[PDB]
Paper text:
Single residue mutations in the antioxidant enzyme [name] ([name]) are reported in familial [name] (fALS) patients throughout the world. The native structure of [name] is a homodimer of 32kDa size. The intramolecular disulfide bond and Cu-Zn metal coordination impart higher structural stability and keep the dimer intact. The [name] mutants in [name] have a toxic-gain of function by destabilizing the functional [name] homodimer, consequently inducing fibril-like aggregation with a cytotoxic non-native trimer intermediate.
PB is a linear unsaturated fatty acid chain designated as (S, 2E, 4E)-4, 6-dimethyldeca-2, 4-dienoic acid. Intriguingly, in the present crystal of the [name]-PB complex refined to 1.90Å resolution, the PB ligands bind to [name] at two new binding sites: close to the dimer interface and the lateral region, which is close to the electrostatic loop. The crystal belongs to the hexagonal space group, P6322, with five [name] dimers in the asymmetric unit. Four PB ligand molecules are bound to the [name] proteins in the asymmetric unit. The ligand-binding site at the dimer interface is formed by the C-term part of the β1 strand, a loop connecting β1 & β2 strands, the β8-strand and the N-term part of the Zn-loop in chains C and D. The compound is wedged between the K9 and Q15 side chains of the chain D and D11-P13 residues of chain C’. The ligand is supported by hydrophobic interactions from the carbon side chain of K9 of chain D and P13 of chain C’. The PB ligand is bound at the lateral site region of three [name] chains in the asymmetric unit (chains B, C, and I). On superposition of three ligands onto each other, it is revealed that PB anchors to the binding site through ionic interactions with the residues N86 (chain C and I) and the backbone carbonyl group at D124 residue (chain B). The aliphatic part of the ligands contributes to hydrophobic interactions with L42, A123, and L126.
Author numbering:
A (entry chain B), B (entry chain A): 0 to 153
């Protein structure tokens, strides 16, 4: 019944932010928006990972949320992880003003992302086009800069 | 659905801990265990609040999770909030070795607490027996010392 969710991103370094999720219809897309600061200018992978487990920091969130056991892709690919939201772009001040609409993640059902972990990564997601085994798993997006558990919101 | 959940508790002060949840059968009880350190010796209210919203620290989690619109009570009362897990006891070293079993919360379905916020409070929960308005809402457990969003665990 959740139509709204929210996530506070934190990590070891300066990266932090707040990301909102809104889904007016359970059969409709999820709007994803907010601000992340402290990033290097440019593209950063932006993924929902499987577990809402931050006991060992972002490492314990596990791999990309992939209940259909597909290969990694970009959000517009048919072959993609449910958690594959592509990249977000930080401006010259280090601020990513996130604005994504996605119809594969959901706030309910099998693809529900509530209770899982949103992660913003060190470098660009290659969207599965990197030609190596890592590309088909993580997009070569590198280390986890900040994360948080996605929670139900008012 | 989920059989395991986990929660990392943090706050403005020194209180921190890790709480695990286990529900081997979807229609059976939830086991809740772990360790919270940095507490004053004695009883501390221990509740699931409605929203997994940490944007204002523990404040934005809202009231106790109460989908059945009941009055506050202790875990063994029939008249209780779903989020009413009672008290946890911190020893002389400031450590609460939590061990709770509850049949009202769940890790799936309508009483699902995944994506909501676990909070440990400053004072004892009076279990609804304090004789004022506050008693039947929060148990007079006082301020929110630490909290975290409850996430799906491996
Ligand atoms: C190992 C460094 C590769 C970085 C390359 C110059 C750009 C990439 C991968 C971005 C791709 C994209 O736009 O998705
Ligand atoms: Zn992926
Ligand atoms: Zn209550």
């Amino acid at each position: 019944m959740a139509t709204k969710a929210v996530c506070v991103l934190k990590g070891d370094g300066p990266v932090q932010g707040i990301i909102n999720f809104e889904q007016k219809e359970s059969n409709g897309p999820v709007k994803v928006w907010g601000s992340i600061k402290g990033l290097t200018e440019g593209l950063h992978g932006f993924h929902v990972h499987e577990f809402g487990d931050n006991t060992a920091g972002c490492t314990s969130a596990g791999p990309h949320f992939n209940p259909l056991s597909r290969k990694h892709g970009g959000p517009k690919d048919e072959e993609r992880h449910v958690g594959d939201l592509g990249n977000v772009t930080a401006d010259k001040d280090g601020v990513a003003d996130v604005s994504i609409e996605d119809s594969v993640i959901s706030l309910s059902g099998d693809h529900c992302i509530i209770g899982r972990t949103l992660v913003v990564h060190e470098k660009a997601d290659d969207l599965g086009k990197g030609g190596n085994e890592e590309s088909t798993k993580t997009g070569n997006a590198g280390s986890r800069l900040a994360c948080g558990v996605i929670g139900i919101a008012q």
